[PDB]
């Protein structure tokens, strides 16, 4: 029939205005902000999250965080 959307020419749109284009990618970094709460498929890849180093070297005191301040 008419494909149930009643448009045959091309994609129609409600809005109108001046076009806006993207900026080029200039500078890159190895770092991302710390993780949020919820995770889904494909969010555990090594090297694509964090600061590229284990948290031990940045925070040495966190190494033996099991033992309390008594010692």
């Amino acid at each position: 029939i008419r494909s149930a959307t009643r448009v045959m020419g091309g994609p129609v749109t409600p809005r109108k205005g001046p076009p806006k284009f993207k900026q080029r990618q200039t500078r890159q970094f190895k770092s991302k902000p710390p993780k949020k709460g919820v995770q889904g498929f494909g969010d555990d890849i090594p090297g694509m999250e964090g600061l590229g180093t284990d948290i031990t070297v940045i925070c040495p005191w966190e190494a033996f965080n099991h033992l309390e301040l008594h010692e």
Partner: peptide, 18 residues
Amino acid sequence: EDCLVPPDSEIVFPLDIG
């Protein structure tokens, strides 16, 4: 067959409308 929309008969909404 009567409910699948081909790429040409589309309607596109920017996400500040509706």
